[model samples]
Target: SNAMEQFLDNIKDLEVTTVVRAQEALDKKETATFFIGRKTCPYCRKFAGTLSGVVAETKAHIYFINSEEPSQLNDLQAFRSRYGIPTVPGFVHITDGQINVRCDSSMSAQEIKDFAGL
Candidate 1:
């Protein structure tokens, strides 16, 4: 958990929050990308490192959503339903208060940058 916290801290303008906060960001029309994954997933942990690199080079903001968290399960499920995300380590891009894309595969830093148009 400490390592995860440190990893999250290094990303500028990244928001690690709950589903409620995510909804607030959407409502505010923030340009944001969500990294949806479970805490225990190894791939998710690796993706965090990749994302940190991307965040360093881009102006886009990121949100880390841990779907395994009990409080966020319902909201996470709702988000998945709304965005059609079918797997963990998913990426959801929101632009101008709308979902622009939903990617359910693992991605490299460059892939993420290109996908995000950063």
Candidate 2:
């Protein structure tokens, strides 16, 4: 049961979303935000705590992607390439839908809110 879900389960307003959904949204030039990380990643764990607080404060709706899912690894890789995410623990906010604003490391609440555009 603990095989997955930690990265997203720990966050307050992180709704589960798929890479394909995010890609489709981007292709349509629609605004969307997603967190790509693994359940067992330490950096992701740290980021999850701050992200939970940030989302709670602003009530922002953030989507989640389980990067370790084998079924989606290839798709995730492609999606990451399209955006600027070169690794795990990636946070991307696509306000313009054509370009991406992304963060690849852990951050403070203020920075997180800014990244989330909340």
Candidate 3:
């Protein structure tokens, strides 16, 4: 079952997975998209909701990695540092074996849509 739904009700299309699965996709250079955020943070909550809304509109497939938890520390740290993500609400778009990361405060819904190229 998708885990992000408890907090972000609109997150039906986005799959709530983990950093490990995301890393697999990253390492394989698979055409993928990912979002790193936490249910505890307000901005992340907003980002999650907005991303889901765009998912409904554009039918984008994205992986959601809920963060900073003790269980996912090492793996999360690995990809976070590898991508140089400085904050939550991180958006990762892997296209043609290339990756783009955007991490900071909440980004606009339109920005999220544009980043996904949806």
Q: Report every candidate's CA lDDT.
A: 0.70, 0.75, 0.77
**lDDT of each residue in 3-94, candidate 3, tens digit only:** 34555676556788877776677678777788887877777777777777778777778877877777888888887887888788898888
Candidate number of the best TM-score: 2
How many collisions between residues are there in candidate 1?
A: 0
Worst 10 residues of 1 by lDDT: 5-14
Residue range 1-118, candidate 1, lDDT tens digits: 8766654554435677766665666799877667777656666667777887788776567777777888777887897787777777777776677766545446877888876668
Off by over 4 Å in 3: 1-6
Worst ten in a row by lDDT for model 2: 1-10
**Residue 49 lDDT, candidate 1, scale 0-100:** 74
TM-score of each: 0.73, 0.83, 0.82
Query: Which regions in candidate 2 have their CA more than 4 angstroms from the true location?
Result: 1-9
Q: How close is candidate 2 to the true structure, as a TM-score?
A: 0.83
lDDT tens readout by residue for model 2, 1-118: 3523654557647887779988777778877778888778887787787787777777888888988788887898888787767777888776656656555565788887776677
Residue 104 error, candidate 1, Å: 4.2
Ranking by lDDT: 3, 2, 1
Q: What is the lDDT of candidate 1?
A: 0.70
Better of 1 and 2 by TM-score: 2
Model 2, residue 91: distance off in Å is 0.5
